[PDB]
Design a protein around this ligand. Structure first.
Ligand SMILES: N#Cc1ccccc1Cn1ccc2ccc(-c3cc(N)[nH]n3)cc21
Ligand SMILES: N#Cc1ccccc1Cn1ccc2ccc(-c3cc(N)[nH]n3)cc21
Lengths: 203, 215
């Protein structure tokens, strides 16, 4: 059983979402004035989300058992290992930022009462945490109980299509030769596309 | 001026993209994102898009015949065909910059255990094809990857999304004190050379702790 709460100023973006419940919360519901952001101390472009509104939202939503997940380009890497680790958690809260990010004290304050993970889902920049939340939720939930090397190419019928043949070994019924061909394809694809996974220099 | 076509058996998954597009960019003809149900190109009454893998194994593989027809209709020789896959080349910020000046992206979203490899291989004989991974984790299908790619690319196209190496360090804003934590005094010092040096050291420390691979 897992509960996931997602906090965002764009709850609509999360629409693409019994052993797991997912709830989406509008951050603005915790404002009192009739502004969630302000200019950065020390200068710089763009705006930063104020800690005040976040603190009130997280106070209500989180407990000491919560794993608070904060997407950010500056985070620790979120990998399949991370997804395995989080798949056995009772409660994930995903705090989705916008603008140029969230005041650091939100995470620092939260870490005084719960576990906090600032994470990056890849080396590119999004406009906010929502797309990262969808990625994290998908990668985690498919591993929940009750639900290295790159994969090689896959094929299905027909055996010949547009004059292109399925590799004959896959039609041979020889499990050992198929196992070996697939292993070779995987290691070949890994060296070509992700040499770092095998301990070699990146392009 | 960019056209993006997304092909998927879950067209509603792409709803957040069409939502996050400012009307001004659309009416200025800067961008157009269209989403297509793959089942429109199925051949049978059961609208089949998958079939068992040659060589055996778990799960299912998406049929080449259906994808071939869809891409034939949607793509041209000028198309950059983007195919998300856990086994792809890494999609990075550099990739996003490169793709941001393309006239036509087509994103082919797979499900099940992926798409028959002949689809990409056939397409590559008449257009540019890019099999890409967005990170080292496994999704259920290509749609969340398409969302990430579209957002990372379109935020680099001037005026499209409303937005205007070492890791970035921490950021702070009002109030100067909150739950017992003060904003680092240096940021309020008005010594802008010192602030830059402080920020640089924060970046260096954070990169060491979180991403030593970058050093
Ligand atoms: N933060 C930040 C930030 C900093 C500088 C420029 C733009 C942004 C946008 N942004 C605001 C919230 C937020 C959340 C997560 C991502 C994110 C994660 C990955 N892996 N890429 N992008 C980005 C986010
Ligand atoms: N392919 C495949 C596959 C292979 C084995 C197990 C599960 C899947 C699921 N799947 C089907 C389509 C598809 C597309 C993109 C991703 C994807 C990309 C990143 N960076 N992670 N996951 C996954 C996709």
């Amino acid at each position: 059983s897992m509960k996931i709460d997602v906090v965002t100023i764009f709850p609509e973006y999360l629409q693409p979402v019994g052993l797991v419940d997912v709830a989406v919360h509008d951050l603005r519901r915790w404002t009192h004035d009739v502004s969630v952001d302000d200019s950065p101390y020390g200068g710089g472009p763009g705006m930063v989300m104020k800690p005040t509104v976040w603190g009130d939202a997280l106070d209500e939503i989180c407990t000491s058992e919560t794993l608070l997940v904060v997407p950010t380009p500056a985070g620790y890497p979120f990998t399949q290992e991370t997804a395995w680790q989080w798949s056995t958690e009772d409660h994930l809260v995903i705090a989705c930022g916008r603008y140029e990010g969230i005041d650091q004290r939100v995470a620092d304050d939260a870490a005084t009462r719960m576990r906090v993970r600032e994470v990056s889902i890849g080396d590119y920049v999004l406009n906010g945490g929502e797309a990262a939340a969808l990625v994290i939720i998908e990668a985690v939930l498919r591993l929940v109980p009750g639900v290295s090397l790159l994969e090689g190419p896959s094929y299905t019928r027909p055996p010949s299509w547009r004059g292109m043949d399925v590799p004959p070994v896959l039609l041979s019924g020889d499990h050992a030769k198929i196992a070996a061909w697939r292993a070779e394809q995987s290691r070949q694809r890994t060296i070509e596309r992700r040499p770092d996974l095998l301990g070699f220099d990146s392009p």
